[PDB]
Amino acid sequence: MEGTEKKFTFWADKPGAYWVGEGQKIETSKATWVNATMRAFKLGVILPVTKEFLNYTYSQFFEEM
Amino acid sequence: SNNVKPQVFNPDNVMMHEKKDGTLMNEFTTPILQEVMENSKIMQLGKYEPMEGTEKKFTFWADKPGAYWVGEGQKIETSKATWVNATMRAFKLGVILPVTKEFLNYTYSQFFEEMKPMIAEAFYKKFDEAGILNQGNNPFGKSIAQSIEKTNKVIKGDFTQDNIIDLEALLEDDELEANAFISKTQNRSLLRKIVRIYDRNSDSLDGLPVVNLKSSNLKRGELITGDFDKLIYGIPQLIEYKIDETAQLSTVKNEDGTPVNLFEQDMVALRATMHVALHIADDKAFAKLVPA
Amino acid sequence: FISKTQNRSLLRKIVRIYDRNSDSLDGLPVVNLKSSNLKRGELITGDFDKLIYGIPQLI
Numbered sequence: 001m002e003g004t005e006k007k008f009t010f011w012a013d014k015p016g017a018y019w020v021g022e023g024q025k026i027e028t029s030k031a032t033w034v035n036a037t038m039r040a041f042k043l044g045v046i047l048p049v050t051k052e053f054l055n056y057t058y059s060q061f062f063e064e065m
Numbered sequence: 066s067n068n069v070k071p072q073v074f075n076p077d078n079v080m081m082h083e084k085k086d087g088t089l090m091n092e093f094t095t096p097i098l099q100e101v102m103e104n105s106k107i108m109q110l111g112k113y114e115p116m117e118g119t120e121k122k123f124t125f126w127a128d129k130p131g132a133y134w135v136g137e138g139q140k141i142e143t144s145k146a147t148w149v150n151a152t153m154r155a156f157k158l159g160v161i162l163p164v165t166k167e168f169l170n171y172t173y174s175q176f177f178e179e180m181k182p183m184i185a186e187a188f189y190k191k192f193d194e195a196g197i198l199n200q201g202n203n204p205f206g207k208s209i210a211q212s213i214e215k216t217n218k219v220i221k222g223d224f225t226q227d228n229i230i231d232l233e234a235l236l237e238d239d240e241l242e243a244n245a246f247i248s249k250t251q252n253r254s255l256l257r258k259i260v261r262i263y264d265r266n267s268d269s270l271d272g273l274p275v276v277n278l279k280s281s282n283l284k285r286g287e288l289i290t291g292d293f294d295k296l297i298y299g300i301p302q303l304i305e306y307k308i309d310e311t312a313q314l315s316t317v318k319n320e321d322g323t324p325v326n327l328f329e330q331d332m333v334a335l336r337a338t339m340h341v342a343l344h345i346a347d348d349k350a351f352a353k354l355v356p357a
Numbered sequence: 358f359i360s361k362t363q364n365r366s367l368l369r370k371i372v373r374i375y376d377r378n379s380d381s382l383d384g385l386p387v388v389n390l391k392s393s394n395l396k397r398g399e400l401i402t403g404d405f406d407k408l409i410y411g412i413p414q415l416i
Contacts, residue, residue: 003091003171004082039089041069042167046329226370234366240391242362262369271369272377 001040008036072165072330073320079332080176082167093172095179102182105189106276107196107298107343110245116155116299116342123151125346153344155301156204158188163314163325163334177308177335184337185304190280196298196343197247197289200282205343209247209289209296212348220354224255224288226262228354229270232290235352246270247289250277255285284356291351302340309334358382359401362389367397 013032020026047065054061071083083089114121128147135141162180169176195203199210213219220232233243248256248270256263256270268275273290283289310333314325327334345351360368360382368375368382380387385402395401 003089004167005089005091042331044331230366230369234363237363237366240363 001038004040006038008038010034010036074325075318075320076316078163078317079325080162080164080168080172082165082170082172090168090172095173095175102186103190103279106193106247106278107296108189108192110276110293111296111298112294114153114297114299114342114344116153116301119155119301119340119342121153121299121342121344123153123344123346124148125151151344151346153207153297153299153342155299155340155342157338157340158191159336159338160184160187161314161316161334161336163317163327163332166331166333169333177306177333180335181304181306181337188304188337188339188341192341192343193278194280194282196296197278198280198282200280207343207345209291209345209351210353212345212351213289213353216349216352218349218352220352221357222354223286223356224252224259224354226259229256229259229262229288232288232352232354233271233273236291236350239349241292241295241347241350243273243290244293245273245290246275247283248275248277249283249285249287250279252285252288286356288354289351290353292347295346295350297344297346299342300340301342302338304337304339307336307338309336358385358387359395360387360389361395361397361399362391364397364400 010033011031012034013030015029015031017029018027047062049061058064071081071085072079073085114123125148126146127149128145130144130146132144133142162177162184164176173179191201194200195208196205197209199208218235220228220235222228236243253263253265257265263270268277309327311328312334314327314334317325319325325332365375365377369377375382380389
């Protein structure tokens with residue numbers, strides 16, 4: 001999915017067939033499809049730190065978060 | 066909260082990837098400009114003056130030295146050349162374009178590159194209208210229209226051939242040739258049908274070129290002319306672009322009235338700035354025709 | 358023609374015999390003088406090959 005939205009299309013109807021005698025007229029038939037779609041949403045969080053903490057208490061903190 | 070509907074803004078200058086009705090603008094097509102962008106008319110007409118501070122000092126000549134007829138062995142008398150000082154200062158132009166980072170990923174990823182020509186056009190129009198028409202809260206005090214008010218060097222009435230001549234003759238009345246006309250592009254309607262002194266084959270009026278301004282402040286009935294070599298400009302700073310992903314913007318506010326923090330809200334903004342300067346070397350060099 | 362540059366104001370609006378496309382008057386060139394002694398209303402012309410000058414001492 002490259003954009004924030006995506007499209008799907010699916011078959012829905014399939015053609016018929018008939019029995020025809022010799023020199024009788026052959027009849028017609030029809031196919032059909034249907035569509036569906038999905039979109040994306042955003043997740044987020046922020047973690048703030050006092051820079052003394054990141055020097056004198058827990059240097060690795062963000063790598064462990 | 067986990068509130069997912071998009072952020073409303075005020076003044077609403079922020080570019081967004083989805084509309085409040087839920088329309089995500091995927092598969093968007095890059096716009097194409099209808100006309101073509103305008104150049105600066107001041108930079109077309111005026112003299113350039115290389116400047117590197119925000120301020121310049123000029124020297125111009127004023128009095129020429131004389132000469133005398135001397136008989137054989139008669140005393141050669143003296144004479145004085147004189148000059149006059151002038152000065153011009155720069156002021157800063159700038160604008161900011163805020164963008165939601167989804168827009169810059171999914172709608173229109175080249176947006177900030179495709180905007181640079183339009184930002185320049187916005188500054189050129191802002192400069193021209195400030196220096197010619199005295200409009201848009203100009204900073205200089207110096208302008209063409211403010212010079213014509215001070216000299217009161219105004220013809221009153223309609224575009225008769227007598228008035229078109231008297232307009233230019235009011236500069237000849239001080240030994241200055243006019244060098245161009247400044248016109249509202251809408252008023253060819255009048256200049257065409259007088260008797261001809263105008264031609265559209267070049268857009269010239271009595272052989273001098275016509276330059277069109279393209280803003281709402283110059284009316285139908287008005288015409289400007291002068292010796293545009295007496296108008297001088299400089300540019301200490303060619304347009305500089307800075308893109309920022311974390312600053313606060315105070316001038317744009319959220320729906321609740323809070324400022325827009327570009328980091329918390331996942332946004333981007335382009336700041337552009339330019340420094341530009343204007344001087345009018347002789348305020349008598351410009352004259353105007355105005356309807357009564 | 359010898360003309361005060363200020364008096365195009367008159368030569369323009371008569372009927373044309375003048376043009377500013379060259380600054381000529383009836384096809385002869387106009388030369389502008391640029392001093393206060395030649396007035397607005399005055400125009401001079403002649404066969405200027407009959408006017409002769411010389412310079413024994415360059416400046």
